[PDB]
Design a protein around this ligand. Sequence first.
Ligand code: HEM
Ligand code: HEM
Lengths: 52, 445, 420, 302, 102, 32, 55, 55, 53, 78
Amino acid sequence: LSRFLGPRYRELARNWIPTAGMWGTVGAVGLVWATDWRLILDWVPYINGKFK
Amino acid sequence: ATFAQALQSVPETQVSILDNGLRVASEQSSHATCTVGVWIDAGSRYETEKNNGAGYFLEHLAFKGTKNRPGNALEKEVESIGAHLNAYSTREHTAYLIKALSKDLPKVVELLADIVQNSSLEDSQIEKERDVILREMQENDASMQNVVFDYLHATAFQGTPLAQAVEGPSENVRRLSRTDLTDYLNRHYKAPRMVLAAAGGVEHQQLLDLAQKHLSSVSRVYEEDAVPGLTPCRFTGSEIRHRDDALPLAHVAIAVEGPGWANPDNVTLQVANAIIGHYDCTYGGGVHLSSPLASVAVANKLCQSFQTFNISYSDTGLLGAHFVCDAMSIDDMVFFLQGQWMRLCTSATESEVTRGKNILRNALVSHLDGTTPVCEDIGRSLLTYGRRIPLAEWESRIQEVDAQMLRDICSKYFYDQCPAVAGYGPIEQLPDYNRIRSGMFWLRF
Amino acid sequence: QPQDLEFTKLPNGLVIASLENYAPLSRIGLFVKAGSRYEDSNNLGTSHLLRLASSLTTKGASSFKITRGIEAVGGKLSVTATRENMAYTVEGIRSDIEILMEFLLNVTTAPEFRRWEVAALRSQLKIDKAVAFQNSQTRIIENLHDVAYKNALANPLYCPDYRMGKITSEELHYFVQNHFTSARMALVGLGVSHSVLKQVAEQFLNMRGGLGLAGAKAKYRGGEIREQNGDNLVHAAIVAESAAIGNAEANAFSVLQHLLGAGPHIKRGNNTTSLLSQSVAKGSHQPFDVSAFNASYSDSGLFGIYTISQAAAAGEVINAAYNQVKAVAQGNLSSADVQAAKNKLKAGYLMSVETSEGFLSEIGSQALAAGSYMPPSTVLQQIDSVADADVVKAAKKFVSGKKSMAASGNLGHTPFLDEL
Amino acid sequence: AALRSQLKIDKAVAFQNSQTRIIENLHDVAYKNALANPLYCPDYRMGKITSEELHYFVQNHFTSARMALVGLGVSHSVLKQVAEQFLNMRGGLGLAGAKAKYRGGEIREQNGDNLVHAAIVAESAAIGNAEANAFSVLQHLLGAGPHIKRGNNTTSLLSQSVAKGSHQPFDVSAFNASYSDSGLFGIYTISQAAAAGEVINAAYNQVKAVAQGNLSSADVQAAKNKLKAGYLMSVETSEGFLSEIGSQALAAGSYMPPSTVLQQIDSVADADVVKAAKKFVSGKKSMAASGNLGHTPFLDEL
Amino acid sequence: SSKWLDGFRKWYYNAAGFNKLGLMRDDTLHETEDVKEAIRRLPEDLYNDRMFRIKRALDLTMRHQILPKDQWTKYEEDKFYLEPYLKEVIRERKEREEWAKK
Amino acid sequence: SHTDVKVPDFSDYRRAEVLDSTKSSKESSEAR
Amino acid sequence: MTNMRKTHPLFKIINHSFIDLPAPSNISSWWNFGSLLGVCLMVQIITGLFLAMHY
Amino acid sequence: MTNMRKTHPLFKIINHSFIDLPAPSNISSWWNFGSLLGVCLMVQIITGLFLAMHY
Amino acid sequence: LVANLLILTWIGGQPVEHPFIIIGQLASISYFSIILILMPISGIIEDKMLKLY
Amino acid sequence: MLSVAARSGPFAPVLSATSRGVAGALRPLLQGAVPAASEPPVLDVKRPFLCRESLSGQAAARPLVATVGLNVPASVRF
Ligand code: HEM
Ligand code: HEM
């Protein structure tokens, strides 16, 4: 509750924003690559070729 | 008075150059005593594997007799005036220093000149000091932290002149002869590589006059027009293990390549080393220590001691930690020390940065308290910086150090870098090099 | 502008001193007369546990608050204890010396001494005693004080193994409330203002104002104790009764100590001016280390010879050193040797003073002992005023006095007092 | 190497009680050599004693001229047959010794025990002397221990003198230990921490009165009767009889019958008892003390 | 006013049931980290009394019985021995959390 | 003594950018 | 000789989990239901094995 | 702070069995066949699960 | 809560007519509100009742 | 020069015991370590002595003698 509400924990969180966002980006691209998500993969120019 | 105006009220030092290039530096204080020494840029990095014990053996023979004062007349003079005569040798620098009163400065300068430029090496005295240095090598390998430091230097700078120890191997000790010592003396005791540093109750003009009287015309000439040059040393990420289970405790030192003397990141790495810190079993802090590694060590009874060190040489060095622990907690201490290193690399915080800055300021000024340590600082600073860095400039750099640039320099010098590991004792618990590197990086950044 | 010591006597018995040199670091020392000599047989080791209890919970600051605050400002707190005295020193920047000084005053004056905390601290006490007794010199010195004195100074500086685990918060509170009284306390400071140190002393030094429990006067018993431990390097200290500290005879004994040799001035040296080293090296080719041991506390002093030698040559080394001191007592010494000894003594005194920690210790010890500060030039004057006949009298007093030996090692050839 | 741990355990079990430690310290501070050697292995010497040292000790001291093979319920022919069948191949007298010079002195082990032990002794005669016989009679006169379970010890002069001015539990006795060339006679006191000085001073003043000559011939005869009864009860057990036979064979090389032993015990005179008490009073002192010694006196205070 | 509150607290203390097993409130306190630290900070006699009361309660609830009516812990004599130790432990913990916060 | 402990030559296994000891690393650690 | 029950590895696992396990002395009949669930699982495994044997 | 791999019980078992298992450094390629047997067992289990899903 | 679970079992047994819809709705609402809200508030109430703070 | 450090030259760190209750900024020389000191064996507690009647008989009056055996307990007689 109030344990993680302070300036030190806030600046730790701000330091970890780019890493957490990068890991979320990795998870998103891995999800669309594994599931072959059409709605995202009809925009990148090369991978558009195989779906036709 | 505040810290800034106190540090600017600390008096400056005076540096002058003679005709031969020998530097003369002094700092005048209010004490009734003084420390006057000669710092010479000679050591194991200059020795070339055939004269590896030459500098330290000359350190032995410096006070055992000179040309003007044969035998122990120099010792009698120093003891009669009541001075303390000391010397040390390190892979960069050799220092011959005298602590005395302010009224015996001409005698101190004359004795220093007689020690440096007028060394006499008798064959019988060479044999006696050869016996003494062999016994000292036995008493030194009876110790353990010096063994680990030598092993770390060897495994980190293997194939380079920086790997060889100050004492030299026993074969070079037994084969060293007077001609090779005189060759080392006439090759490495030139004027431009010597600074005469006086600190305490000294007058700069009087010291300069004494330098022009005694330290004038030391060699000035190599007699072959062959000036030695210090090539850069290759850092080798590597591991040396010396397993011997009869020893009760295990010493492990893990280091990486340092920044060098001239690198401005040395202050930041000293801040990080102050954040991580040092600890031994006699500390009364307990679990309440601000250092997380020390607190975990106290709580889990991991190590007897640890310390962070930052040794610097000409554009190189060793930056890391050394710990003494039992045979069953080496893996735990390596894991926690690596975790602390990556925590400083990735998620260092401003409170820890401020704490480390205060600790570095206090340690720096407390080390620059005392006539003999400030004389040491003057000599070493004129040897490796070309000048003496004022405490105001040090405080300015420390204030310039903040959290983001600490994380940047820590990631530059620690993240994903191949380390040098030196283990001695029951080091079965010490993991392999692959595991140490896997601890040296993180899978979550 | 480096000012002199502002020195005053706050009327509850307190001694206040301050030197404002505008040093970048300030240092506050508080010196109490609560050494191990004020214990009796029922509270041995209480001084050791109190020395190690400097980072516990106080009435105004918890242990966590003390440790984390001092490390957060970067300062350091240390306790230096000798058999008569205990000094609490704090070190830090001028911008935080208010809260460091407040923490030191809390620790020295208002300790909680919770029972679980000292029960946890007993293990660290055992660790500290082991680390201290790693080297045999201090073991010889505690053995020597134990065999030399009867009650007061015979109490060891470290807690005995039977008292390890029997010291309690009741005994700690009794010791603090009986010896930490303001009439035995000196609050000295370097880099701090006399006005601010005086006002904090008046503000938070008004709860204990007695004279304190007067300790028993130390008595001399003499005799020998030996520690057969099989080390080939035999240590042996042979001392005798000398004068108390702050005496002309004490000055003569210090001059005699530096005449006979009080440590090396050259590393890896031969100690050519040390008469003991010359006498030993004239008879033995084995390695050795012989010096003069002097230790003067406020009641009395011990003077003698400390020898480290081989197991076989211990007898001849000890006999040669004793014969050298006998020759000095009979009067076989030179005025040049006495002058060199005086020069060594005054130089060593000045190099002790020149560092800020040594200067603090000297100011606090002088404030506790004499009640007033003695400037160094007068100490130079006294050392010069020591005569050679006083050195002869001091050596004669040593050789004629009853002796105490503490020995350790392989004692197949170490002699006894009847053979010396 | 496996047995040195058993050495450590056996020393701990031996030092479970404090009288062993007191007697070891007493010999250690009474003699310079040859009797100051501890009967148990030192803590540093645990882990250091070698089979080479054991073989050296056996080859230098387990020799034929210093052994005696005695037997009860066995034939002399069988005994001598096995004697020349085994014990014929050892050298001779071997190493002599060091004559056990006396030194005096005192040590005080403060260990916080609930009772204070203190032994104050001096030199006496060796085994085979009328002076030693007088010292043993003097020991039994001053009280060698209780003959009655849970008794008051009404005849022992040390217990009477201490109980005259004490109201605390105590145990005072005359310690006697003779050897081949030297002896130790003194007082052993176990008392409270506060009353230790009073107990030691009362015992020392009682022995001083005995030395001055405050004694009766009836008490000397009772002491001789106690000594005769103790010696005969030592002999009456076959274990004690074998031990006495072996000790006599090693010491004198001849049999002294118990009738002749009691004859010389009766031949002990009371003037020699006074002389032995005076010798203990005037002799140099060795003190071994342990406990809580806030009030235990020193040797110069006695 | 508050007398009715005291009587209602008395009735609830009877209804809770730990008086029937010879227990106290601090005996029935669940051991978290702060509670275990307080129990470790307890003196020897209070530790022994608490531990015996816990053992007797376990024996009674194993037998599925209670103490006799005259042997119950009355609400007047139900002393709170763990309150100062628990309060100082929570105070030290909160100081630690605030220091880690800043 | 412990000073005689010297690391043997590993030049049969070193990388192409590491074979010399007169050239410092960290110009090739990134590449490796 | 040795204690097979606490030195044999499978035997010492069984002993440390089920035989010499320190259990609370006062747990009621409601604590039997874990073993009831385990024996239910075993019984259903056997009976369903026979059902799939003939199914 | 503690070591989760050496403290958490499932992680402790995995660490003592497969992660920090003291293994001889000189075992040949013939010692990989235990892991190959385990991997083939897992492959057979999954593959037969799909076969009986359609069988 | 146990009683409400029995109510939910019986409601799942019976079909969708009046008043089974509103009985099941009230049963589910009471179930969720008890197991999320009422037990912790009642625990706080008992702590204040036995004077824990 | 009214202090142990200013009077005893090399004996100052021997006569003075320094304890750093809070870790300093600079590292200390000769940190030291406890090399795992052994533990004495656990033995049965010998009885105390509270009355003089049971106290009598335990003051030594004969030389110390030890006795070990193959199958008899190791005794000591005073
Ligand atoms: C190895 C374990 C098991 C096997 C092989 C197995 C096999 C089977 C088979 C073959 C049937 C069909 C026969 C029939 O419907 O009457 C069945 C039915 C059933 N099984 Fe299992 N079963 C196993 C375990 C379980 C478990 C663990 C449960 C419950 C948690 C369970 C619950 C049921 C139920 C409820 C039926 C329906 C029977 C009916 O409605 O008549 N089974 N099982
Ligand atoms: C959980 C584990 C397994 C399951 C569920 C399973 C299931 C099956 C099924 C349903 C079939 C018939 C499908 C077909 O043959 O087309 C089959 C065939 C077979 N299984 Fe398995 N199986 C398992 C494990 C194994 C193992 C461990 C082995 C051998 C070590 C094995 C060996 C075979 C063989 C040899 C066949 C016949 C293939 C052929 O005739 O070509 N199976 N299995």
